[PDB]
Amino acid sequence: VVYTDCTESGQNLCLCEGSNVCGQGNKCILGSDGEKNQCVTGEGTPEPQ
């Protein structure tokens, strides 16, 4: 039950915490304002098409 990496801050079923998944029910923000990545809960969508 693993996924792929994200492409931008905001997706969900991707990898944002280094290589750990970050997203279902929540929403990560990888590299904020040209900064770092972090996981927060919110409004987004799965990365897989």
Curated annotation (Swiss-Prot):
It comes from the Eukaryota. The keyword Transmembrane helix does not apply. One of its GO terms (cellular component) is extracellular space. The keyword Glycoprotein applies. Keywords: Blood coagulation cascade inhibiting toxin, Disulfide bond, Glycoprotein, Hemostasis impairing toxin, Pharmaceutical, Protease inhibitor, Secreted, Serine protease inhibitor, Sulfation, Toxin. GO terms for molecular function: serine-type endopeptidase inhibitor activity; toxin activity. It is found in: Secreted. Its main location: secreted. Residues 1-3 are annotated as: Interaction with thrombin active site. Glycans are attached at residue 45. Belongs to the protease inhibitor I14 (hirudin) family. This is Hirudin variant-1. The chain holds residues 1 to 49 of 65 of the full protein.
